[PDB]
């Protein structure tokens, strides 16, 4: 019997507004003893469901909350509690003070032209993090269907402390134990043409994700309007390689965008390739 | 009664050779219970005094050991023990697995042209570290007289874990409570011309040090032979600013190389300026 973690609305204080997500509104706040009796006023994020909103939207809201209760993995955003008896509904998430990956990446590049505040090893660690999360989703028979940096989160705001990224928005995730959409730049050709979604289209999008990471948050297909994108892609056109991107990481990405879905790597292999490259590169610098 | 920390030569095992420093030989090894009874086989570095070497050199060796016993500060290399009853003499230092700052800087720049493995904030933290060490030496009435990246050490080999640099070679340090030399590129004009050394010539050299940090270990005055350097400097010539070096840090460096020794900043002000710039820059990125 699946149970969402009920949490006393009284012990929750909404302090900062972080943005307007969904329908829709997210706040930083504090929640007493979320982590237990020896917790304190630990900071949290709060996802809210607007009052009076569609009965259908409330269901999507509840769907999300259920997906996140089900998941338990270091690279998957934690849902710490819910407030569902009173409106507005609250989904209480662990606070990721670095905000969304995309923003965290772009601040890193734009902070000083002395150089990015994230290095190649930093970026490889981000990729390794998200890929573990993908391994996990696959093992749980879930397809995320919207893998992109805007949908991941970073645990710290600064660029010096140890950091972790997590997948953090499962509004489109689907169980696959057996008229909307938008993000054309992340979608596999099968998905755009035939409306088909699989773990292998997730692999296409992870390819785009790690491209986003390696460019520090550039827009895919910068010279193409949304409309031209599907032309471009459907052709056989692919993104340009990031400036000075390691050949190993380009070959991985490239294979993620195999036209033929069964010619793409698996998530396990993708994580292997990422860990393999990291060790190679670490070893490489020390022997210098 | 000044006492060097005597340590049982038996509990020491010389494993790796790290290089040949002084007269002269340094090893990585392990030393049982250096940190106390609950220590274990903790890794150390070992500075050795060659057998049969000059009676005078042994004195310089002993001088160093005494200087380092006297000092206790987070940014000054720890001397953990000595082996002075038997030859070869051993000075047992905490291991700084990043090696010397200069090498650590150059590996950072040469590891991938995707970008340096040290960012501006990393480098500013290095400068802040060494400047605290300089504040301390001054407060102890000591002049180091050879401040340079080759003479500092980094606590870790990788470029991700928290790191600290320390001043680590006091072969030339002098107490100032009241025919050798070489490093012309680090020496104040008074020092080269008149053989004069003060805390203010130390400030000149720290200027050069932080230049070394900000260029990731480039040689000062690259277009000048050692001979031409004193001409160049004695004129009024100064180093070029590092590529994309923050204006605040250029103004600091520049002032460290004031022709007139009393027109140079103090170490306290230098540390203030460094901490002030760091906060400004951190604040700067977040509000972006
Ligand atoms: C549901 C929401 O959750 C969080 C948001 C933040 C931190 N931690 C969590 N859990 C956050 C953001 N920006 N900033 C400055 C902070 C902070 N601190 C991003 N944001 C406004 C979002 O709406 C968003 C975006 C993507 C995603 F996957 C979840 C979320
Ligand atoms: C006296 C010596 O001490 C140490 C050396 C090292 C680490 N920790 C300590 N204490 C070290 C070095 N390289 N590498 C790879 C390691 C390691 N691990 C540098 N080196 C060979 C030096 O001789 C040297 C240079 C400058 C300085 F200030 C002290 C020293």
Q: Which of B119, B159, B285 sits opposite A115 (nearest CB)?
A: B119
A224 in Cβ contact with A184 (< 8 Å): no
**Closest-approaching ligand to the CA atom of B95:** 2
Distance CA A276, CA A272 (A): 6
**A288 located within any domain:** no
CA–CA distance, A206 with A149 (Å, rounded to integer): 9
Domain shared by B254 and B126, yes or no: yes
Alpha-carbon distances of B19 from B3, B16, B27, B57, B104, rounded to whole Å: 28, 9, 7, 18, 15
Question: How many secondary structure helices (H) and strands (E) does chain B include?
Answer: 8, 9
Residue A76: inside a domain: yes
Q: Are residues A67 and A143 in the same domain?
A: no
Sheet strands (E) in chain B: 12-19, 26-32, 41-49, 79-83, 89-94, 142-143, 152-154, 165-167, 174-175
Q: Tell me what percent of chain B is helix, strand and coil, each rounded to the nearest 5.
A: 40, 15, 40
Q: Residues B270, B258: contact at Cβ < 8 Å? A: no
Q: Which residue has the tokens 């509000």?
A: B287
Query: Long-range contact list for A47-51, CB < 8 A, 24+ apart?
Result: A47/A21, A47/A22, A47/A90, A47/A91, A47/A92, A47/A93, A48/A24, A48/A88, A48/A89, A48/A90, A48/A91, A49/A22, A49/A23, A49/A24, A49/A87, A49/A88, A49/A89, A50/A23, A50/A24, A50/A25, A50/A88, A51/A87, A51/A88
Residue with tokens 């990956």: A101
Experimental resolution (Å): 2.4
Looking at B49, B79, B95, the residue that finishes a domain is B95
Best residue among A22, A26, A28, A90 to mutate for probing ligand 1, ranked by most atoms within 8 Å of CB? A26
Marked catalytic residue, from B125, B146, B169, B202? B146
CB contact under 8 A, B112 and A120: yes
Same-domain check for residues B88 and B104: no
User: If we measure between CA atoms, which residue out of B137, B235, B239 comes closest to residue B186?
Assistant: B239
The residue among A75, A95, A115 that closes a domain is: A95
**Residues A158-161: contacts with CB within 8 Å, 24+ apart?**
A158/B282, A159/A108, A159/A111, A159/A117, A159/A118, A159/A122, A159/B119, A159/B121, A159/B285, A160/B121, A160/B122, A160/B125, A160/B162
Q: How far apart are CA B221 and CA B208, in angstroms?
A: 10
Report the residue from B115, B281, B288 with minimal CB separation from A120.
Answer: B115
- The count of C-alpha atoms lying within 13 angstroms of the C-alpha of B250, restricted to the half-sphere facing its C-beta, is 10
Name the 3-class secondary structure at B230.
helix
The CATH number given to whatever domain includes residue B44 is 3.30.200.20
CB A5 within 8 A of CB A82: yes
What SS3 state is found at B80? strand
In this structure, what token pair is assigned to residue A247? 């050949």
Q: Helices (H), strands (E): how many in chain A? A: 8, 9
Residue B285 lies in a domain: no
Please give the Cα distance from A230 to A212 (Å, whole number). Answer: 19
Per the domain annotation, does B287 fall within a domain? Answer: no
Distance CA A274, CA B131 (A): 39
Confirm or reject contact between A116 and chain B (CB < 8 A).
yes
- Whether A285 is covered by a domain: the verdict is no
Residue of A nearest to B245 (CA): A114
User: CATH number of the domain that B140 lies in?
Assistant: 1.10.510.10
Residue B221 lies in a domain: yes
Measured distance CA(A169)–CA(A181) in Å, rounded: 15
Q: Kindly provide the b/e burial profile for residues A13-40, where b requires at least 16 CB atoms within 10 angstroms of the residue's own CB.
A: eeeeebeeebeebbbbbbbeebeeeeee
Same domain, A138 and A86: no
Last residue of a domain, one of A95, A123, A149: A95
**Dihedral class, residue A237 (left if φ above 0, else alpha if ψ from -120 to 50, else beta):** beta
Measured from the alpha carbon of residue B43, the closest ligand is 2
CA–CA dist B149, B130 (Å, integer)? 10
Q: Please indicate whether residue B83, judged by its CB atom, sits closer than 6 Å to ligand 2.
A: no
Measured between beta carbons, the chain B residues lying within 8 angstroms of A115 are 115-116, 119-120, 244
Does the residue B286 lie in any domain?
A: no
- Classify B128 as helix, strand or coil: helix
> Which helix (H) or strand (E) covers residue B276, if one does?
helix B267-286
Q: Diameter of chain B by CA atoms?
A: 63
Specify if B180 maps to a domain.
Answer: yes
Query: Ligand 1 test: best mutation among A44, A64, A153, A212, most atoms within 8 Å of CB?
Result: A153
Output DSSP code: residue B261: G
Distance from CA of A130 to the nearest CA of B (A): 18
Nearest CA to ligand 1 atom 28: A168
Phi, psi of A214 (to 5 degrees): -70, -20
Which backbone phi and psi does B17 adopt, to 5 degrees?
Answer: -90, 125
Which residue, among A219, A201, A199, A19, has the nearest Cα to A100 in the 3D structure? A19
**Residue B149 DSSP one-character state:** G
Q: In terms of Cα–Cα distance, which of B267, B261, B265 is closest to B192?
A: B261
B123 φ/ψ angles, rounded to the nearest 5 degrees: -70, -40
CA–CA dist A118, A125 (Å, integer): 10
Q: Identify the three-state secondary structure at position A272.
A: helix
Is A153 close to ligand 1, i.e. is its CB under 6 Å away? yes
- Together in a domain, A77 and A191: no
Annotated binding-site members of B: 18-26, 47
Residues B80 and B223 in one domain: no
The verdict on A105 and A232 lying in the same domain is: yes
Active-site position among A146, A175, A194, A262: A146
- Say if residue A171 is in the same domain as residue A147: yes
* Residues A110, A74 share a domain: no
User: Encoding tokens for residue A136?
Assistant: 């996990």
Angle between helices A101-110 and A199-214 (to 10 degrees): 20
CB B92 within 8 A of CB B45: yes
- B262 and B124 inside one domain: yes
Q: Please state, in angstroms and as integers, the Cα–Cα distance from residue B3 to each residue in A158, A215, B68, B167, following that order.
A: 44, 57, 11, 22
Assigned token pair, B148: 């340079």
E-strand spans in chain A? 12-19, 26-32, 41-49, 79-83, 89-94, 142-143, 152-154, 165-167, 174-175
Phi-psi region of A115 (alpha: psi -120 to 50; beta: other; left: phi over 0): left
Domain that holds residue A48: 1-95
Is the omega angle on the peptide bond into residue A30 within 30 degrees of 0, that is, cis?
no
Domain count, chain A: 2
Q: Are residues A71 and A112 in the same domain?
A: no
Count of CB atoms within 10 A of residue B21's CB? 14
* A81, A129, B212 from A275: Cα distances, Å: 33, 10, 33
Peptide bond preceding A88 in cis form (omega within 30 of 0): yes
- Cβ atoms of A135 and A203 within 8 Å: the answer is no
Same domain? For A118 and A36 the reply is no
What's the CA gap between B210 and B235, in Å, rounded? 22
- Show Cβ contacts of residue B66 under 8 Å, excluding neighbours closer than 6 positions: B2, B4
- Smallest CA–CA separation between B108 and chain A, in Å? 8
């Amino acid at each position: 019997i699946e149970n969402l973690p009920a949490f006393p609305r009284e012990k929750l204080t909404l302090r900062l507004l972080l943005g307007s997500g969904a329908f829709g509104e997210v706040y930083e706040g504090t929640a007493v003893d979320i982590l237990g009796v020896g917790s304190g006023e630990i900071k949290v994020a709060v996802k809210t469901l607007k009052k009076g909103s569609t009965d259908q939207e409330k269901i999507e809201f509840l769907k999300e909350a259920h997906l996140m209760s089900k998941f338990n993995h270091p690279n998957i955003l934690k849902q710490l509690g819910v407030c569902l008896l009173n409106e507005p509904q609250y989904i209480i998430l662990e606070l990721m003070e670095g905000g969304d990956l995309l923003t965290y990446l772009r601040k890193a590049r734009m902070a000083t032209f002395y150089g990015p505040l994230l290095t190649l090893v930093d970026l490889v660690d981000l990729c390794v993090d998200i890929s573990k999360g993908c391994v996990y989703l696959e093992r749980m028979h879930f397809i995320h269907r919207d893998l992109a940096a805007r949908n991941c989160l970073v645990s710290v705001k600064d660029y010096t402390s140890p950091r972790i990224v997590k997948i953090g928005d499962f509004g489109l995730a689907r169980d696959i134990y057996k008229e909307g959409l938008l993000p054309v730049r992340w979608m596999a050709p099968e998905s755009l043409m035939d409306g088909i979604f699989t773990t292998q289209s997730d692999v296409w999008s992870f390819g785009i994700l790690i491209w986003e990471i390696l460019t520090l948050g550039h827009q895919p297909y910068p010279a193409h309007s949304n409309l031209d994108v599907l032309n471009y892609v459907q052709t056989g056109g692919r993104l340009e390689p990031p400036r000075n991107c390691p050949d190993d990481l380009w070959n991985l990405m490239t294979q993620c965008w195999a036209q033929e879905p069964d010619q793409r790597p698996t998530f396990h292999r993708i994580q292997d390739q990422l860990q393999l490259f990291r060790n190679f590169f670490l070893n490489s610098i020390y022997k210098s």
